Amino acid sequence: DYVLYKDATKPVEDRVADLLGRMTLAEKIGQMTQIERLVATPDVLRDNFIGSLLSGGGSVPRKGATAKEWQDMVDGFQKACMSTRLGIPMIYGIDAVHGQNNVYGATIFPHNVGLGATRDPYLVKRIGEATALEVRATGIQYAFAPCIAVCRDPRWGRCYESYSEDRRIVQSMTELIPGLQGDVPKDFTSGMPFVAGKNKVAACAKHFVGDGGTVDGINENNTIINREGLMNIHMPAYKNAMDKGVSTVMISYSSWNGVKMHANQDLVTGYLKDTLKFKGFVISDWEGIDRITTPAGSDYSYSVKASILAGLDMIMVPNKYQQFISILTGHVNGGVIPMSRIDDAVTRILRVKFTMGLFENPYADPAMAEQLGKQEHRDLAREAARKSLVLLKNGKTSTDAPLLPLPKKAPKILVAGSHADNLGYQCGGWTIEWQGDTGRTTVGTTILEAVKAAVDPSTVVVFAENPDAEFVKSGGFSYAIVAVGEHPYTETKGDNLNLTIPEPGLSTVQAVCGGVRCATVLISGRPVVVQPLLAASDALVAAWLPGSEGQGVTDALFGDFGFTGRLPRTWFKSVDQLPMNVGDAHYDPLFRLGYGLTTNAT
Numbered sequence: 001d002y003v004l005y006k007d008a009t010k011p012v013e014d015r016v017a018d019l020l021g022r023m024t025l026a027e028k029i030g031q032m033t034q035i036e037r038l039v040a041t042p043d044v045l046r047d048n049f050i051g052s053l054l055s056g057g058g059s060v061p062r063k064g065a066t067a068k069e070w071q072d073m074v075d076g077f078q079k080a081c082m083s084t085r086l087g088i089p090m091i092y093g094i095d096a097v098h099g100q101n102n103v104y105g106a107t108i109f110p111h112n113v114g115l116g117a118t119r120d121p122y123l124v125k126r127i128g129e130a131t132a133l134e135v136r137a138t139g140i141q142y143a144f145a146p147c148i149a150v151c152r153d154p155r156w157g158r159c160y161e162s163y164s165e166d167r168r169i170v171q172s173m174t175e176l177i178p179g180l181q182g183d184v185p186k187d188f189t190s191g192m193p194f195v196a197g198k199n200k201v202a203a204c205a206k207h208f209v210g211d212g213g214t215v216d217g218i219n220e221n222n223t224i225i226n227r228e229g230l231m232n233i234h235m236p237a238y239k240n241a242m243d244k245g246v247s248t249v250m251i252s253y254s255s256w257n258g259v260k261m262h263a264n265q266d267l268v269t270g271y272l273k274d275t276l277k278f279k280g281f282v283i284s285d286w287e288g289i290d291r292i293t294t295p296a297g298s299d300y301s302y303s304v305k306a307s308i309l310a311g312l313d314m315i316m317v318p319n320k321y322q323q324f325i326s327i328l329t330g331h332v333n334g335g336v337i338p339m340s341r342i343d344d345a346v347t348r349i350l351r352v353k354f355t356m357g358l359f360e361n362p363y364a365d366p367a368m369a370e371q372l373g374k375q376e377h378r379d380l381a382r383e384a385a386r387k388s389l390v391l392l393k394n395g396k397t398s399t400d401a402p403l404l405p406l407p408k409k410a411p412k413i414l415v416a417g418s419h420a421d422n423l424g425y426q427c428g429g430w431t432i433e434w435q436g437d438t439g440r441t442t443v444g445t446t447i448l449e450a451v452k453a454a455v456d457p458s459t460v461v462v463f464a465e466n467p468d469a470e471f472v473k474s475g476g477f478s479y480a481i482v483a484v485g486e487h488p489y490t491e492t493k494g495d496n497l498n499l500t501i502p503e504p505g506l507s508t509v510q511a512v513c514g515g516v517r518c519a520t521v522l523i524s525g526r527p528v529v530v531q532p533l534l535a536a537s538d539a540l541v542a543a544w545l546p547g548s549e550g551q552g553v554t555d556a557l558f559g560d561f562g563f564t565g566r567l568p569r570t571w572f573k574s575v576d577q578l579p580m581n582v583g584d585a586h587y588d589p590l591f592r593l594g595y596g597l598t599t600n601a602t
Ligand SMILES: *[C@@H]1O[C@H](CO)[C@@H](O[C@@H]2O[C@H](CO)[C@@H](O[C@H]3O[C@H](CO[C@H]4O[C@H](CO)[C@@H](O)[C@H](O)[C@@H]4O[C@@H]4O[C@H](CO)[C@@H](O)[C@H](O)[C@H]4NC(C)=O)[C@@H](O)[C@H](O)[C@@H]3O)[C@H](O)[C@H]2NC(C)=O)[C@H](O[C@@H]2O[C@@H](C)[C@@H](O)[C@@H](O)[C@@H]2O)[C@H]1NC(C)=O
Pocket: 437, 438, 487, 488, 489, 493, 494, 495, 496, 497, 498, 499, 500, 501, 502, 503, 504
């Protein structure tokens, strides 16, 4: 007879309610299982009724894969899930945190920190729209963004994924959501999930909650703060995400006052779902439930019980799915975990799938391939790159002639530094590889390239990654541009207690600037000890992690556009002041939030 859930002309809730009514137990749990593509197989996916797949940092089908290949891969997996008795389509998620950053040839936009310096939430909304197209260009329908953490201690290896330390800023920046998912209807209820169609993608606000408040900025650690401070600092943006209709929420690895977020039934269920009235689905993090115990995985049986009862709807296993499903099947068979729970988690996972119309467009659109790396997107990124640069210094002394903007016509000029011609570096973490990489890892334009493509044909550009004083003073240069800074990092692998850039860097800035007037470009995902650099430089620019369009940098350096960006974070004097944020008593910055020197165009 007539199968309601299959009829597209029917209401979302009606269809969810109808399908859930036909589901066994194995299928309901299947919908709650998300696994790495690495352990996925048509059989596995079909036999275990897998409801979702993902790709961790660098989990690509083939290094250098085209968009078609990706689509084919995803389509391969979907073909399998569609063959289940009920034919429930799977949702493929990936970390498209600053473009479809895992794909080769994908436009790599500035990381969050840099975007916050722009204060242009509309620019961010356009980035989300772009990223939507490029993630859909590869057949994927779910991006694990935006990360709306409010980094409070730059020693945290994930600070670059935080728009600001000022929640107000992080809120205005949730505009990425409507960009990735499309805008929500006038009526729209705050908390209901939403996605416009096959040209948009489901978004994920992460990581609930207080991931940017751990002690010392130790990744995944504990956040010791009172409910009020937690609610007015780290909680706010989420409220915004509810109104903008965010589709999902990933839970943080970090604990609050000693309690693992994955086990926090009060915040996850009581506050997020019950109070904020979140109707989309909640997903764990990579082995996030295993990390509830200590050691991790020491009692997976507890992790399922504790996490599922806490209120989580989907688990990112992402490898030992057989265990996860066996363990959960048991708990339900034992009455330990009530079916109402499973019913709820599935109800949410489904509601989101019908809403985005996954049941109507489960397969890719080869027409969408072209989107990947589209020039218009690169221009957009280029714009954001320029707008995110924050001028800290521009003249060794009050009386000096402003170094920037530099002339495009000069006899001979010098570009140097470790980050000068290193695409991987200017891109930073989460680029091609999980930890990011060094060198020409994708399609882009390094700073050097931009420069050679901006100066007058009669301007001799000489490159020297790390020259000595002697070389510079004898070069006959009119000026030099040195780029240095941090190296690509991601999560824990990036926590830093000394926060001083790697060498050589300062040695190079000092060697070059001591030989000729210089403009120093600092590549970093956060504020770092900068006095030494500022001291040796005539002008110094904080470019954070610009991404693939180096021209964004040179656009400012040569005055085609003037610096407008302003510090999204507080720049410290020494790392022992930390934590130190706007509003604190001992607030003794080296550069307050909002600081940013400027210049004018043409
Ligand atoms: C401040 O604290 C930081 C972390 O808390 C320190 O950085 C970390 O230092 C350890 C060594 O103590 C280092 O060791 C691990 O990585 C080794 C290889 O490191 C290179 O490759 C990785 C990626 O593969 C990069 O992330 C590293 O940044 C590093 O990159 C190379 O750096 C060279 C010099 O800067 C450069 O010539 C290369 O081109 C560049 N190569 C690439 C591909 O980028 C590995 O052998 C070892 O077994 C460990 O696994 C960590 O890698 C390093 N940082 C990170 C993010 O992991 C920091 O130490 C200082 O700075 C470092 C960059 C390094 O030069 C140290 O020798 C130096 O003491 C601390 N700074 C201070 C002043 O104390």
